[PDB]
Write a protein that binds this ligand. Structure first.
Ligand SMILES: [Zn+2]
Length: 257
């Protein structure tokens, strides 16, 4: 058992997964003053038009909206990416309070939550083989501030009551992930890791400058979820976020001047 608890939290993940103290760990603080613009970065392509959501599920760490990744239906191309990355699932990390909840920070500022859209490089045939490579995954990370409710998010919130406890899942079809994007795809990028065990250093990170607004009403529904399984003592699913890890020698490239 790993989690976000006192004894099984990020400070202790290294005991079971030594890579936690690796050279390419995520998330990281994005220093705007030192994250230099890169004119070599190609424009970012997002094709979520024929996207096919299948189910939503509680996995005892967050909730994942999973997609049919059998075809190039919903793909991420260009930016820093070489080849086509298929969307497999998106999930969030969020806090107990509005003041915290994001994994990545910007000049040390935390957001109320962070959205991660997970893609894998079709070059490697399947996800299993993908996570064993440095460029295997691409995660599109989008900050959440508490403001005007996100319409594209309400379909998600409306189903959360039905996957309260770890292990529960539900049919979740015809979800448009375009509903969750901001207007400017202006990003930072760097090579990093999964922010959960086994913390494999296989992720090209693409973090959007532009956060999205969500209503306190929407984020309160997130915090009504359970880490625990059915029949267990209740443990509310909150502060499911890893703090910023050392950047070390890595450079964070910005897509904008
Ligand atoms: Zn994540």
């Amino acid at each position: 058992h790993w989690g976000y608890g006192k004894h099984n939290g990020p400070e202790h993940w290294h005991k079971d997964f030594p890579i936690a103290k690796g050279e390419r760990q995520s998330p990281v603080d994005i220093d705007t003053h030192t994250a230099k613009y890169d004119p070599s970065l190609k424009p970012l392509s997002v094709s979520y038009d024929q996207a096919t959501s299948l189910r939503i599920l509680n996995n005892g760490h967050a909730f994942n909206v999973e997609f049919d990744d059998s075809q190039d239906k919903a793909v991420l191309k260009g930016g820093p990416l070489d080849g086509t990355y298929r969307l497999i699932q998106f999930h969030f990390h969020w806090g107990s309070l509005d003041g915290q909840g994001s994994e990545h920070t910007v000049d040390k500022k935390k957001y109320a939550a962070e959205l991660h859209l997970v893609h894998w490089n079709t070059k490697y045939g399947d996800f299993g083989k993908a996570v064993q490579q440095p460029d295997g995954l691409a995660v599109l990370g989008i900050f959440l501030k508490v403001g005007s409710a996100k319409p594209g998010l309400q379909k998600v919130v409306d189903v959360l009551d039905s996957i309260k406890t770890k292990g529960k899942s539900a049919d979740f079809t015809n979800f448009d992930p375009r509903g969750l994007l901001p207007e400017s795809l202006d990003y930072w990028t760097y090579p990093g890791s999964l922010t959960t065990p086994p913390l494999l250093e296989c992720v090209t990170w693409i973090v959007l400058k532009e956060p999205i607004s969500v209503s306190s009403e929407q984020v309160l529904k997130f915090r009504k979820l359970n880490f625990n399984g059915e029949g267990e003592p209740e443990e509310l699913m909150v502060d499911n976020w890893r703090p910023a890890q050392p950047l070390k020698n890595r450079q964070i490239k910005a897509s904008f001047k």
